[PDB]
Design a protein around this ligand. Structure first.
Ligand code: NA
Ligand code: NA
Lengths: 213, 213
């Protein structure tokens, strides 16, 4: 499977293609305080194991000094929580990266890519997106076109062209995921967008074939 | 590694990134009679083994009924020769596809994709190109933009944007490979082409973001 996420000035956008715990886009929320999204591209067993470890600590942790998603004071600390779950899930496709993002009150929205051993890197304005899965579809186009000042809707359109897809748009400082949408191949808007993209690409190539190589 | 080839009305274009027998683009020729190009994306040992088997039969075959690249009456028969070498090389990265194309006098230029067991498919006007390697870079762009009536130079430009690269252009009915070029990352023409492509893509996206999804 394939998933992708963008960090913009205005917020975060998450997308993944596709039984709740095995779902490739996972959401956690405390109203007005914190929101988190995990994207997976690994096999079903790997996704479930990581989510189960996160939820085990949210639901049953007795030690107050252990950090969970709901006690993490910032998104770096929250990413370490997921990193620990990703590493520990190896005890429970199996060696794919995860994407984790969200926002905690008092701090900007942040986005991370988590590796098999629980280490991670964070999205920057220079590198505002991550892709995970067997094939990072349309990476060259995202590299050339993605910008951190893009509106959330236009980022979503670019992401959808790189690919049913679960799409989540998170607006900065809202601490809720309201804009949640499932888009199938039979969606007429998405088909219309893809048709226009193909037309625009052919026109784009017709311009640049002026140049020699 | 990555390689790609196009079959056009005007001829064939081959490209591969990169010690002669391990080279990822391999050429055979009989002047004015036949030309062949093999592209590999597998490991070094796999490429050498296939080429060695092809050359063994060209150089040492004593049985006249055994088909070689130089006795094949048509390109389908020549593809079977390579297919046999690809399958037999498994006895000698290891499970990647090959691309094989060329022309024999009395017949149009033809292009094939060879699978690990020696079976193959042929390029058509509807599907005029093949890609091989770990990552089929820029497949969505080739799918949307590639056309069988493209000039050889414009096909080459499109192929180069999907990626030092060894580029071969074969013009129909010539039975020679004269237009052979090695293009590095420091090539100013290729850099200029890539810069313009990025600019054109951003402009292309700016047009199509009119549409909703
Ligand atoms: Na900009
Ligand atoms: Na056309």
């Amino acid at each position: 499977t394939y998933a992708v996420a963008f960090r913009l000035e205005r917020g975060l956008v998450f997308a993944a293609d596709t039984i709740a715990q095995y779902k490739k886009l996972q959401l956690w929320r405390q109203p007005g305080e914190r929101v988190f999204v995990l994207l997976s591209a690994g096999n079903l067993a790997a996704t479930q194991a990581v989510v189960s470890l996160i939820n085990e600590h949210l639901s049953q942790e007795t030690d107050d000094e252990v950090t969970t998603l709901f006690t993490a004071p910032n998104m770096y600390r929250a990413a370490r929580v997921v990193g620990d779950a990703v590493r520990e899930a190896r005890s429970i496709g199996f060696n794919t990266n995860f994407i984790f993002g969200g926002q905690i009150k008092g701090e900007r929205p942040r986005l991370f890519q988590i590796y098999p051993e629980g280490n991670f890197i964070e999205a920057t304005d220079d590198t505002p997106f991550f892709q995970i899965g067997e094939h990072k579809y349309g990476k060259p186009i995202l590299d050339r076109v993605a910008r951190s000042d893009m509106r959330l809707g236009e980022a979503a359109k670019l992401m959808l062209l790189s690919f049913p897809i679960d799409l989540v748009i998170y607006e900065r400082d809202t601490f809720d995921v309201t804009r949640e949408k499932r888009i199938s191949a039979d969606d007429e808007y998405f088909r219309n967008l893809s048709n226009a993209w193909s037309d625009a690409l052919r026109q784009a190539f017709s311009k640049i074939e002026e140049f020699d190589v």
